[PDB]
Subunit: 187 residues, 2 copies
């Protein structure tokens, strides 16, 4: 009953005792099968190490059917730590997003501010974010501190130009910034 | 007869006098024009520095027609020192 309800509704005898035998592990296997598919088909090196730049991997799925994967390049992390991978999979351009798990902390690339847009607040000088004082969705008054930065041992506090609402905060505490990076968007 | 032989064909009076005044330099200008086209249409920052990742540049080709170029990424150098640049020209994906 329980396993039929959780999934779509197939469930075999091999599924049933497996759950009974290892309830915590089986459910965690099901989650993983749902997230990544049949990992057993991968070759061991790929299972353990992923892929090199330029490498071609062939994944034998079944008699006469295979995934032909090539990893071309991996971008820098965007402001959210999300890197973009450029694959080719059976002759088809492909783009995937993976969050980098704090292996640079600040080497996120900030999009540059549209200088002809009032809602865009950009960095006047290179420096570091000392304190994020507001987050996305918050209402702020004019002249309200939003952000503190440190350029050359000197602290400037970045303020709201007009009364409005924070729609995207681009940085976290300790992140470095260069002249012109978008920091906050408010309406 | 020297310039027409060198270039595809028809040369102007302005070419003739430019070559005479500056043989080497003019010859070098043709080679760059053959490789890169009309560089003078680039904005100066792009002319001097190229593009940064995620940047979009418009090149005014003519009244109302412009070249829209986005630089997405530059890859690692391959085994022959060749980096792949992933571009977006006029709505189309493009590699160099």
């Amino acid at each position: 009953e329980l396993l039929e309800e959780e999934q779509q509704g197939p469930v075999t005898e091999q599924d049933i005792i497996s759950y009974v035998l290892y309830p915590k592990v089986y459910e965690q296997y099901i989650q993983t099968r749902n997230q990544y598919g049949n990992l057993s088909l991968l070759d061991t090196p790929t299972f353990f190490f992923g892929m090199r730049n330029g490498e071609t991997v062939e994944i034998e799925i079944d008699k006469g059917k295979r995934l032909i994967i090539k990893l071309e390049t991996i971008s820098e992390p965007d402001e959210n730590g999300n890197r973009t991978i450029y694959y080719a999979m059976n002759g088809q351009a492909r783009r995937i997003y993976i969050k980098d798990e704090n292996v640079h902390t600040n080497a996120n690339v900030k999009p540059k501010a549209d200088k002809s847009n009032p809602s865009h607040i950009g960095a006047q000088m290179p420096g570091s974010v000392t304190e994020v004082k507001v987050s996305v969705g918050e209402t702020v008054k004019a002249n309200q501190p939003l952000l503190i930065t440190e350029a050359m041992k000197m602290e400037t506090t970045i303020q709201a130009p007009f009364d409005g609402v924070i729609k995207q905060v681009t940085v976290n505490n300790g992140d470095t910034i260069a002249t012109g990076d978008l920091l906050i968007e408010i309406e």
